[PDB]
UniProtKB/Swiss-Prot annotation, chains A, B:
Subunit text: Homodimer.
The name this protein goes by in its record: Congerin-2
GO annotations of cellular component type: extracellular space
PANTHER family: GALECTIN, GALECTIN-1
Top-level taxonomic group: Eukaryota
SUPFAM superfamilies hit by this protein: Concanavalin A-like lectins/glucanases (SSF49899)
């Protein structure tokens, strides 16, 4: 199903590194950090072709029984279909700090000021090959 | 619920290190590597007090819609309730190689000669605090 790391708490000052491969012909895939599949504090979507979006990163949060909030977008897109990627995430109570494969970084607000997350999952057209959460 | 790493393939030649804390008053907890909660190729149970078993490691496999097979037991038990533990697991097609916190090792046959596992989970009276699978 989706690739999941569940109930191993991702807490303030810990680092998460995930690695994987993008599918050939991928439309989009996302890395999601939150509390459940309906409650995501950081959704990082990698859009190769989705609607009118082509080669864009879109970040947002999804509030439980409410829905997606305001999208933030990034132009940084060092990703290739069929190829490997590696992303490291850490956060404090105000900001998620994301570092991409090529060293570029993206920052996204920690909108709920949460201090720990119990679900990390990947969805869409990619697969995970390793994970370090420590 | 239980602590889970699902659909990030644990393949031949990869290493899994999990760390956690045993509950005070723990009865037993296990680390399970397999295919599903009913299909476990390596169940490593840490029994502080379970029936007649006190401070023993018990290893076994659970075959889907069939049940547990022959138990193997180990006397090695460097574990304390309330304390931290760290275990590293790797396997080839014949053997699971387990290394405990204090450097002692336990080996258990890879009974089905499987080459990859899609579910790792912890159950019982402990919690996981970090994981590296790479």
């Amino acid at each position: 199903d989706r690739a999941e790391v569940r109930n191993i708490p991702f807490k303030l000052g810990m680092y998460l590194t995930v690695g994987g491969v993008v599918n050939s012909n991928a439309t989009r895939f996302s890395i999601n950090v939150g509390e459940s599949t309906d409650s995501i504090a950081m959704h990082m979507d990698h859009r190769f072709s989705y609607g009118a979006d082509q080669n864009v990163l879109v970040l947002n949060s999804l509030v439980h029984n409410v829905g997606w909030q305001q999208e933030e977008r990034s132009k940084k897109f060092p990703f290739t279909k069929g190829d490997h990627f590696q992303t490291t995430i850490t956060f404090d109570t105000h900001t998620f700090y994301i570092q991409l494969s090529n060293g570029e970084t993206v920052e996204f607000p920690n909108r709920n000021k949460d201090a720990a997350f119990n679900l990390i999952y990947l969805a869409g057209d990619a697969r995970l090959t390793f994970v370090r959460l420590e």
